[PDB]
Every structure is written in structure tokens, then in C-alpha cells.
Scaffold this active site. Structure first.
Site, PDB file in Angstrom:
ATOM      1  N   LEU A 170      11.424 -15.230  26.754  1.00  0.00           N
ATOM      2  CA  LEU A 170      10.156 -14.511  26.571  1.00  0.00           C
ATOM      3  C   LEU A 170       8.979 -15.482  26.557  1.00  0.00           C
ATOM      4  CD1 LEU A 170      11.141 -11.910  23.824  1.00  0.00           C
ATOM      5  CD2 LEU A 170      10.357 -11.306  26.108  1.00  0.00           C
ATOM      6  N   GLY A 171       9.195 -16.656  25.966  1.00  0.00           N
ATOM      7  CA  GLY A 171       8.191 -17.703  25.850  1.00  0.00           C
ATOM      8  C   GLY A 171       8.765 -18.994  25.320  1.00  0.00           C
ATOM      9  N   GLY A 204       7.551 -23.229  24.380  1.00  0.00           N
ATOM     10  CA  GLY A 204       6.505 -24.224  24.166  1.00  0.00           C
ATOM     11  C   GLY A 204       6.379 -24.706  22.737  1.00  0.00           C
ATOM     12  N   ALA A 205       6.157 -26.035  22.578  1.00  0.00           N
ATOM     13  CA  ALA A 205       5.973 -26.791  21.326  1.00  0.00           C
ATOM     14  C   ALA A 205       7.154 -26.694  20.337  1.00  0.00           C
ATOM     15  CB  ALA A 205       4.660 -26.416  20.645  1.00  0.00           C
ATOM     16  N   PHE A 206       7.373 -25.508  19.723  1.00  0.00           N
ATOM     17  CA  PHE A 206       8.446 -25.258  18.753  1.00  0.00           C
ATOM     18  C   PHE A 206       9.845 -25.268  19.378  1.00  0.00           C
ATOM     19  CE2 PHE A 206       6.616 -21.078  19.924  1.00  0.00           C
ATOM     20  CZ  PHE A 206       7.725 -20.345  20.295  1.00  0.00           C
ATOM     21  N   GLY A 207       9.980 -24.591  20.516  1.00  0.00           N
ATOM     22  CA  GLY A 207      11.231 -24.446  21.243  1.00  0.00           C
ATOM     23  C   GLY A 207      11.163 -23.319  22.248  1.00  0.00           C
ATOM     24  N   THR A 208      12.013 -22.297  22.071  1.00  0.00           N
ATOM     25  CA  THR A 208      12.076 -21.155  22.987  1.00  0.00           C
ATOM     26  C   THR A 208      12.469 -19.848  22.286  1.00  0.00           C
ATOM     27  OG1 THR A 208      13.170 -20.283  24.992  1.00  0.00           O
ATOM     28  CG2 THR A 208      14.330 -22.079  23.832  1.00  0.00           C
ATOM     29  N   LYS A 267      14.882 -16.802  18.291  1.00  0.00           N
ATOM     30  CA  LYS A 267      14.167 -18.082  18.252  1.00  0.00           C
ATOM     31  C   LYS A 267      15.166 -19.196  17.936  1.00  0.00           C
ATOM     32  CE  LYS A 267      10.310 -20.239  15.699  1.00  0.00           C
ATOM     33  NZ  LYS A 267       9.336 -19.993  14.607  1.00  0.00           N
ATOM     34  N   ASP A 327      -2.963 -16.806   7.916  1.00  0.00           N
ATOM     35  CA  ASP A 327      -3.141 -16.992   9.360  1.00  0.00           C
ATOM     36  C   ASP A 327      -3.219 -15.658  10.137  1.00  0.00           C
ATOM     37  OD1 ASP A 327      -1.416 -18.969  11.997  1.00  0.00           O
ATOM     38  OD2 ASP A 327      -3.530 -18.422  11.772  1.00  0.00           O
TER      39      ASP A 327
END
Ligand SMILES: CN1CCN(c2ccc(NC(=O)c3c(NCCc4ccc(Cl)cc4)cc[nH]c3=O)cc2)CC1
Length: 298
Positions: free
Chosen positions: A22-23, A25-29, A49, A137
């Protein structure tokens, strides 16, 4: 205080299947997937995740908070998988985040949807307030779309975005349910402008001085003074003067009853977004599939 009796569900790797990314980047997938329990004859659409001790600690602190909530307008953790690196299993929100949704569907978003989303976000936030959980946030990027008519709050697992922060938060690092009301006001502004960047071009360091001078975000063209006044009230220096989330539910609900009296959108009434009324609204076997909101239930 009260003991946290929330249940942490451990899921077997073999009980869930990854379909696509789905997406990433940075953190993982993040993956789109299905969770097929033991022999329950159910297929639940899920988001998965997916090794350092610090990262594992951060993902488990996230799981703790997500498992400790249960509200129709708040994203809940379905469970965790304890493979080589910990995996979080959550309900699938097929339309993604609300920030991208309003940017991609602006020509079909009518006053009813915008006002109902404001009610739904206020309901989620009021629940977090009742549970003594301060988001810290809240932004349109942290609101997920289950269906265009049903949105849920996420990323309260952190419980810096200066342009969404209250004055006390920037200067004194004070985070309260009233500082979340400021962020709510900026979120509403994001929706009313169809995903515009707040204080676009202006650097983050100037924001503090701008706010102290008395300058705020501009009135979105579609906003009547009635809607804009609410946003303005969310941005008072005095936190006690700001509306409470239960007041925001009532105010936006009043407006949602006659939406065209509070939001002026050219083309409204002839606008439409996907709904269960649409032919094939819901890749492999689409048999025995049920949403997480209808399965087991806490
Ligand atoms: C053109 N676009 C293509 C990509 N599309 C998209 C659809 C759903 C998600 N899903 C999610 O972002 C999602 C979550 N994202 C927040 C980050 C996160 C991901 C997974 C877990 Cl387990 C925890 C947090 C959380 C829970 N459920 C979801 O469906 C992401 C992107 C939107 C249309």
C-alpha cells in the site's frame, strides 16, 4: 487509576496473507492483506506494517496504545505477529488518508461529506479525551478513510509538526486536549481548502511570532463566517476559550443538517463519491469476506 484490561491478540503468520504494498518509505512497508482466522470461515481485509531493539520497543509501545482503544471513529489494532521483526495487523481503510483523498477527489466532495467528517473527527477526539489520551499529532494525514462516509483517527501512538501545533505546544511543550482542539482547527482548514498546505512557503521558525502577532490561517473560499468562526475559536491563545470536542460535535452536527447553508461549493448536489449503492463498490475470492468492525467485537 483504573487497570487497563485491554486484550493483546497474537496472530500466527500463517493466519494472514499479504496481497500488495500500500505504501513504503522511511519506517518500512505497509501491505494490503487478508486475515483468515483458525476455521471461522471469515476473510478480514487488513493492513500489515512490518531488526534493532529500539525499533522493536517503539512498535510495541504503538501496539499498547492502539490495543487500549475501542471507538467507531478511532483506528484500533487487530493484533501483533511475533516474527523475526514485529508486525502490526490493523483494519483496512481502503481509501487511504483523508489529506490525499480530498486532494484527489475535490471535484466530487460536497458540503455533506466535509461537515460529516468534521463531526466524525470530533467524535474520535472526544472519545480520546474521555480515555485521557492526548493525540499530539492530529492532522488530515492522520485521518483514514474506511468508506467516503466513514473516517477514523490514527497515529496517536506517539501519545515536530509546528504548523498544526497550539501556541503552548511550540513555546512551552504543553500538550493537552485543548491543544488537540487547535490541531483539529488546522485539520478542518485542510479539508475546507481540499488539502492545501497550512502557511505554505512560510518557514517553521516564523510560525511562533506569526501566532503571537495575531495572524491565523485564511478563510477558505467555500467557508461561511459560521464555519470559519469555529476554526478561529480553535486558535485562541487562551486554551480554556477554545471549544471542547463535545461542543464541536454539536456545532458541526447542527451544520450537517443543512450543509448548503454553511459551505458554498459550486457543483454541489450533482457531486457523488463511491458508496455501497454503487455497482461493485466492494481480487481473488470475494466470498466469506467481512470487515473487522463486524467480526468478534470487543
Ligand atoms: C491512490 N492511492 C493508492 C494507495 N491507497 C492506500 C489505501 C490504503 C492505505 N492504508 C493505510 O494507510 C492504513 C493505515 N495506515 C497508517 C500507517 C499504518 C499502517 C499499517 C499499520 Cl498495521 C499501522 C499503521 C493503517 C491502518 N489501515 C490502513 O488501511 C494506504 C494507501 C490510497 C489510494
Amino acid at each position: 487509576e483504573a487497570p487497563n484490561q485491554a486484550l493483546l491478540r497474537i496472530l500466527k503468520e500463517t493466519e494472514f496473507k499479504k496481497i500488495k504494498v500500500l505504501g513504503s518509505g522511511a519506517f518500512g512497508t505497509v501491505y494490503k492483506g487478508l486475515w483468515i482466522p483458525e476455521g471461522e470461515k471469515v476473510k478480514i481485509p487488513v493492513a500489515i506494517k512490518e531488526t534493532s531493539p529500539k525499533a522493536n520497543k517503539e512498535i510495541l509501545d504503538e501496539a499498547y496504545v492502539m490495543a487500549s482503544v475501542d471507538n467507531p471513529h478511532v483506528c484500533r489494532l487487530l493484533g501483533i505477529c511475533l516474527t523475526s521483526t514485529v508486525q502490526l495487523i490493523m483494519q483496512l481503510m481502503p481509501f487511504g488518508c483523508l489529506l490525499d483523498y480530498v486532494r484527489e477527489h475535490k471535484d466530487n466532495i460536497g458540503s455533506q461529506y466535509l461537515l460529516n467528517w468534521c463531526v466524525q473527527i470530533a467524535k474520535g477526539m472526544n472519545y480520546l479525551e474521555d480515555r485521557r489520551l492526548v493525540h499530539r499529532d492530529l492532522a488530515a494525514r492522520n485521518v483514514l478513510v474506511k468508506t467516503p462516509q466513514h473516517v477514523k483517527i490514527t497515529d496517536f501512538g506517539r501519545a515536530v509538526p509546528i504548523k498544526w501545533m497550539a501556541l503552548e505546544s511550540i513555546l512551552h511543550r504543553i500538550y493537552t486536549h485543548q491543544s488537540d482542539v487547535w490541531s483539529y482547527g488546522v485539520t478542518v482548514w485542510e479539508l475546507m481548502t481540499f488539502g492545501s498546505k497550512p502557511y505554505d512557503g512560510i518557514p517553521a521558525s516564523e510560525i511562533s511570532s506569526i501566532l503571537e502577532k495575531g495572524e491565523r490561517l485564511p478563510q477558505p473560499p467555500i467557508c461561511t463566517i459560521d464555519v470559519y468562526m469555529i476554526m478561529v475559536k480553535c486558535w485562541m491563545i487562551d486554551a480554556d476559550s477554545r471549544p471542547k470536542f463535545r461542543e464541536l460535535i454539536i456545532e458541526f452536527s447542527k451544520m450537517a443538517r443543512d450543509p448548503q447553508r454553511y459551505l458554498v461549493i459550486q457543483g454541489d448536489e450533482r457531486m457523488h463519491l463511491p458508496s455501497p449503492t454503487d455497482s461493485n463498490f466492494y481480487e481473488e475470492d470475494m466470498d466469506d469476506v467481512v470487515d473487522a468492525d463486524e467480526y468478534l467485537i470487543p
